[PDB]
């Protein structure tokens, strides 16, 4: 039912309006119970997230507590590590750009609060290189914090030691991937690894490692402060907590609001943000989780609401919860076509199914926009789509297939007409 | 992806980190874990790019040298990332975001305007060697869709003439107020701040017991 209270809202500094710097952060009281929390114990911190039942705030959804629980196993003589990926290459994920730029500190204490939960020696934050200015803001914030002694050895007047670092991204969406963030951190080409050697087991520099969406690291200190329950209540069943929602494209006031999860899709454009540009009936389709997730047409649009369980029922993913909206004024065949162009210019090429498959769909999709291709080809793109979906080394091939599948699933008649249109003029 | 040695772009172009640059280098390595020079190549390659935009084959060889890694190792890193430029870069190097979010909100619109203003095709440097336009992909900051990152200018929410205005500012003078030239602040509902219009609770507000 959304409509979270401002007091409950996590990032009060969202939209700025409060000094992103430490003195603003102190008025925010972000560093209020940090010593106590760490003192309580690592086990106490994970109890808090397990009670919260928080799901991954990045595109993949998994219990946050269980993921952190995995490398809570005893150290084998290799320093455990924390990796925070501030890269958000996915379209509509300007969300994480907020916490980093507007409220850098929340993430800094998120890092050490999270750090003792996994007993990480240190945390590296991979902010996308594109955001150079953004980087300027966080290390100013990180510098403040150590000057204070909030972070560093004996951080926050406690036995525990932590050091936080910022790493430059270099314009790659794939760098975002969990195994590939590591390799970029390692300095090799940004190519994902296979999951068998799981990230905790062989992390970075062969030392256990864990990767979290910046939102996931940022909420952990406040969730421990507010307790898992407070946070647990807002969510729906497995779904829980407020997740920032970004609405971009064909809406009167595109904005990122951290309104509550489980929001009726019709409600968030209509009530907050801006009602769909041109009217709620001028909605050819909604992209709920960003480019990777399949778009849902207006028919199912309001019925369903934004929570991961409800979306998977709907065949779409909450993902980064980036709402991209397409009025009846857009050539979807071309809209999704550029997302496949978005993925041919970006997939690493390490795996055969994504390399040739994504390029193959790009060629077919461009012909589909022209209408040159015959109607029978449509289904083949589908068959090409699932070959890529289950065979890829990472999830990006998973992601490339879904928008193609969505276009065929709900807009098959329109593509046939574009097929028909070209055949008629000869 | 092949460096055919050319008089301009080839090692005859000597490269060496400024005494100041070399300093920056050491710092980088330490930031990274002990005994792991390799992690520092993407940052060290970035400072070679900071030094000079061209970053020729000579510059990459130096990077490998300073970082004591297989030279190819540096060559592979430079080729994989779009951030690094292996060819000369225009002073301004504007990049226009053309992913679906920006296109839906008119990103394409901007392009046509910029091509005419720079009076040049998309993808190459102006004769003045002062501007370079490229159709880059999602640069983040989608809520503000119309967008053009010029060396981190990340101007956003830009109407066509806005850019023209910005380009002129760049063409005569400098620092043209980089950022969303729109009235809104950072990302904010153009209407206002529905999320939080109240004052923020202070330190230790409703902090749970335990």
């Amino acid at each position: 039912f959304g409509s979270l209270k401002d007091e409950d809202r996590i990032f009060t500094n969202l939209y700025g309006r409060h000094d992103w710097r430490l003195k603003g952060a102190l008025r925010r009281g972000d560093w209020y119970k940090t010593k106590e929390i760490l003192l309580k114990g690592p086990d106490w911190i994970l109890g808090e997230m397990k009670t919260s039942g928080l799901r991954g705030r990045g595109g993949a959804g998994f219990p946050t507590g269980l993921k952190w629980s995995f490398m809570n196993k005893p150290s084998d003589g290799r320093p455990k590590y924390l990796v925070v990926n501030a890269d958000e290459g996915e379209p509509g994920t300007c969300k994480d750009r907020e916490i980093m730029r507007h409220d850098p500190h929340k993430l800094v204490e998120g890092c050490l609060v999270g750090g003792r939960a996994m007993g990480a020696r240190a945390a590296y934050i991979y902010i996308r290189g594109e955001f150079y200015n953004e980087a300027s803001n966080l290390q100013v914030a990180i510098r403040e914090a150590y000057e204070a002694g909030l972070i560093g050895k004996n951080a926050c007047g406690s036995d525990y030691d932590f050091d936080v670092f910022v790493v430059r991204g270099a314009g790659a969406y794939i760098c975002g991937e969990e195994t590939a963030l590591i390799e970029s951190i390692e300095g090799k080409q940004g190519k994902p690894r296979l999951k068998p050697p799981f990230p905790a087991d062989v992390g970075v520099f062969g030392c256990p490692t864990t990767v979290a969406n910046v939102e996931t690291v940022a909420v952990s200190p406040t969730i421990c402060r507010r307790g898992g329950t407070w946070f647990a209540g807002f969510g729906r069943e497995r779904n829980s907590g407020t997740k920032l929602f970004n609405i971009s494209g064909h809406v009167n006031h595109p904005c990122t609001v951290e309104e509550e999860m489980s929001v009726p899709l019709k409600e968030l454009i209509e009530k907050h943000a801006g009602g769909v540009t041109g009217g709620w009936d001028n909605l050819l389709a909604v992209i709920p989780g960003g480019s990777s997730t399949p778009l849902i047409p207006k028919s199912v649009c309001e019925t369903v609401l934004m929570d991961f369980d409800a979306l998977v029922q709907a065949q779409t993913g909450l993902g980064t919860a980036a709402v991209i909206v397409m009025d009846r004024s857009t050539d979807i065949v071309k809209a999704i076509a550029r997302l496949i162009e978005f993925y041919k210019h970006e997939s690493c090429g390490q795996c055969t199914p994504c390399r040739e498959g994504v390029d193959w769909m790009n060629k077919v999709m461009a012909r589909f926009v022209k209408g040159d291709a015959r109607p029978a080809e449509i289904d083949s793109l589908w068959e090409i789509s699932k070959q890529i979906e289950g065979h890829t080394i990472c999830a990006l091939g998973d992601g490339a297939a879904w928008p193609v599948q969505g276009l065929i699933r709900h807009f098959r008649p329109e593509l046939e007409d574009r097929m028909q249109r070209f055949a008629q003029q000869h | 992806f092949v460096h055919r040695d050319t008089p301009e772009n080839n090692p005859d172009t000597p490269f060496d980190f400024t005494p100041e640059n070399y300093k920056r280098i050491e710092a980088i390595v330490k930031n990274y874990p002990e005994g792991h020079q390799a992690a520092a190549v993407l940052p060290v390659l970035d400072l070679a790019q900071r030094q000079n935009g061209w970053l020729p084959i000579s510059a990459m060889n130096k990077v490998a040298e300073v970082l004591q890694v297989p030279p190819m190792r540096v060559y592979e890193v430079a080729t994989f990332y779009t951030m690094y430029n292996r060819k000369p870069v225009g002073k301004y190097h504007i990049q226009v975001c053309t992913t679906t979010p920006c296109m839906l909100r008119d990103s394409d619109s901007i392009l046509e305007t910029l091509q005419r203003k720079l009076g040049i095709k998309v993808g190459e440097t102006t004769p003045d060697k002062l501007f370079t336009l490229i159709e880059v992909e999602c640069l983040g900051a989608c809520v503000n869709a119309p967008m053009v990152q010029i060396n981190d200018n990340y101007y956003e929410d830009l109407t066509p003439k806005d850019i023209e205005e910005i380009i002129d500012e760049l063409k005569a003078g400098k620092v043209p107020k980089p950022g969303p030239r729109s009235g809104r602040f950072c990302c904010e509902p153009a209407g206002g701040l529905t999320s939080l219009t109240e004052p923020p609770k202070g330190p230790g507000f409703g902090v749970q017991a335990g």
Binding site: Q139, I142, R143, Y146, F165, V166 | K23, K30, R50
Partner: peptide, 13 residues
């Protein structure tokens, strides 16, 4: 500044 992020790194170091 082109090197401001990098200069900010040395102080942290």
């Amino acid at each position: 500044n082109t090197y401001t992020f990098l200069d900010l790194n040395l102080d942290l170091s």
